[PDB]
Design a protein around this ligand. Structure first.
Ligand SMILES: CCCCCCCCCCCCCCCCCC(=O)OC[C@H](CO)OC(=O)CCCCCCCCCCCCCCCCC
Ligand SMILES: CCCCCCCCCO
Ligand SMILES: [K+]
Ligand SMILES: [K+]
Ligand SMILES: [K+]
Ligand SMILES: [K+]
Ligand SMILES: [K+]
Ligand SMILES: [K+]
Ligand SMILES: [K+]
Lengths: 103, 212, 219
């Protein structure tokens, strides 16, 4: 069980916790702001997933400052976790290519 | 804020028929619309959520449709228990909003009123009071008059009436006329009558009683 | 079981303030929001504000003059709405509902009737109502009971503690010089009376006074 596979794992779980706390904090921050649409958990969660993967359809978005802060954190956790996985994949490919070379 | 327009305000339909209520939003809200039912003196009751999703415990009679800005709440085969006020509410954008409401009304077959007169009780008399109550029950249409005649002479003082909204058991109406006199004023009179003129009978339905 | 419980009624003088309650029970979550709707007699529903127990944050309907203030109490599972400095305009039935963060109110409280006047509380007076001798009866017989001299609204009138529903009619109250008055009507088969009891239960929340009154034939 190599580090790079532990961080990836630890990053997927952590991502899921952020998605969830994100959907939660998002609604809490957005309710109260007139015209706001990020106001029910079920969709707030879909909003999160879309933001973490950075797809950002725009059908949903925070309009308050805290909502936006929650947004920044979700984006970053998403980018960091997905980048941590591709990093784990490069450690795997790089170490194995060494094997196929003898070393 | 979103504005849900619910028009017409009142709907008149014949039994067993199909009925449709409308809700209009100031702007597209998807299907984030929900219907509530509220009978006379009751609290609201969820009927349909997200415009079409059915709720458990609610007759299969109720169904909703629509998306965007136009939504409809239908009832397949109306019936007495369905008489009430219906509201729509939106969850699309904060703050949640309610419709002005729509009252359902059924039109049944004419029904003559069942009159009943009551002599004040002794427990009340013992306290310097005398109220002669008269009930005009289960009639239709709701239009009806009640004439009070004391010892042959019509009366208008002290008469307080009260009508009920269409009953959700049989779609009819009922009224209550109350003449409040003191023990004294009551003592010096013999017969009290209560006349009811209604569309079903040219001749007024009467009911009286003598103090002795 | 009744998930939200509210006080049948509350009386308040102008300029004063009251604190309503809504104790919840059943499947409670952290995602739960408790809402408060205001309904003036005859008019429709009106959203006042929301509060999330688990976090304790509250939002109010900014379109209307802000009079309410929401708070909660985790342990007891009770939400509180502090309405202050009221007028005639502020008197109506105030409901509370539970919303599970998905937008619709699945369950509502029985609501609390709130009256804003100076007139003091006055328990009702229940007087029987049995026919008169000359009253020739048929298959059905109509009985009833008069509730008057009370304040403020409302009053709940039952027949045989609920076992008797079919045939009841309870007319709306009438206000005459700071005292409401109303009559309820019951209609059972002629035979069944008075062989079988027929009592009218009259609860009046503003004075904590529920009273019974059997309906028997006259002298
Ligand atoms: C991580 C970054 C999160 C940015 C959230 C911005 C929310 C804007 C808002 O809806 O804010 C709402 C709020 C007003 O209701 O704005 C405010 O007062 C709060 C101020 C917020 C941010 C700084 C102001 C601008 C800084 C850039 C200027 C640089 C010049 C060089
Ligand atoms: C990381 C951002 C803080 C969490 C959101 C708090 C919202 C408070 C409500 O106004
Ligand atoms: K992208
Ligand atoms: K993108
Ligand atoms: K995009
Ligand atoms: K986009
Ligand atoms: K777009
Ligand atoms: K667009
Ligand atoms: K990338």
């Amino acid at each position: 069980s190599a580090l790079h596979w532990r961080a990836a794992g630890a990053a997927t779980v952590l991502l899921v916790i952020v998605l969830l706390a994100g959907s939660y904090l998002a609604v809490l921050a957005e309710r109260g702001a007139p015209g706001a649409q990020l106001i029910t958990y079920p969709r707030a969660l879909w909003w999160s997933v879309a933001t973490a993967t950075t797809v950002g359809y725009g059908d949903l978005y925070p309009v308050t400052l805290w909502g936006r802060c929650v947004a920044v954190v979700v984006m970053v956790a998403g980018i960091t976790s997905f980048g941590l996985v591709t990093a784990a994949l490069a450690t795997w490919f790089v170490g194995r290519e060494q094997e196929r070379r003898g070393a | 804020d979103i504005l849900l327009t619910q028009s017409p305000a009142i709907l008149s339909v014949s039994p067993g028929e199909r009925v449709s209520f409308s809700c209009r939003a100031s702007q597209s809200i998807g299907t984030d619309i929900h219907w509530y039912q509220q009978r006379t003196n009751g609290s609201p009751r969820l009927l349909i959520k997200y415009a079409s999703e059915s709720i458990s415990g609610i007759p299969s009679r109720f169904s909703g449709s629509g998306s965007g800005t136009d939504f409809t709440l239908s009832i397949n085969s109306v019936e007495s228990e369905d008489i009430a006020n219906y509201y729509c509410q939106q969850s699309n954008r904060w703050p949640f909003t309610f419709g002005s409401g729509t009252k359902l009304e059924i039109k049944r077959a004419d029904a003559a009123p069942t009159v009943s007169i009551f002599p004040p009780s002794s427990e009340q008399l013992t306290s310097g009071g005398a109220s002669v109550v008269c009930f005009l029950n289960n009639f239709y249409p709701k239009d009806i008059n009640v004439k009070w005649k004391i010892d042959g002479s019509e009366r208008q003082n002290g008469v307080l009436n009260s009508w009920t909204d269409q009953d959700s058991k049989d779609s009819t109406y009922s009224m209550s006329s109350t003449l409040t006199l003191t023990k004294d004023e009551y003592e010096r009179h013999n017969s009290y009558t209560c006349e009811a003129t209604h569309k079903t009978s040219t001749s007024p339905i009467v009911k009286s009683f003598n103090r002795n | 079981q009744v998930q939200l419980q509210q006080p049948g009624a509350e009386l308040v003088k102008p300029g004063a303030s009251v604190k309503l309650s809504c104790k919840a029970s059943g499947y409670t979550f952290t995602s739960d929001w408790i809402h408060w709707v205001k309904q003036r007699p005859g008019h429709g529903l009106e959203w006042i504000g929301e509060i999330i127990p688990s976090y304790g944050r509250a939002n109010y309907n900014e379109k209307i003059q802000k009079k309410a203030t929401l708070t909660a109490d985790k342990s007891s599972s009770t939400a509180f709405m502090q309405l202050s400095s009221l007028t005639s305009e502020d008197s109506a039935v105030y409901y509370c509902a539970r919303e599970r963060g998905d937008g619709y109110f699945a369950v509502w409280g029985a609501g609390t009737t709130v009256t804003v006047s100076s007139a003091k509380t006055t328990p009702p007076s229940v007087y029987p109502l049995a026919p008169g001798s000359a009253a020739q009866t048929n298959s059905m017989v109509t009985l009833g009971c008069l509730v008057k001299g009370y304040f403020p609204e409302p009053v709940t009138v039952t027949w045989n503690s609920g076992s008797l529903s079919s045939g009841v009619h309870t007319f709306p109250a009438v206000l005459q010089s700071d005292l409401y008055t109303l009559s309820s009507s019951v209609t059972v088969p002629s035979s069944s009376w008075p062989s079988e009891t027929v009592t009218c239960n009259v609860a009046h929340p503003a004075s904590s006074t529920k009273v019974d009154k059997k309906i028997v034939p006259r002298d």
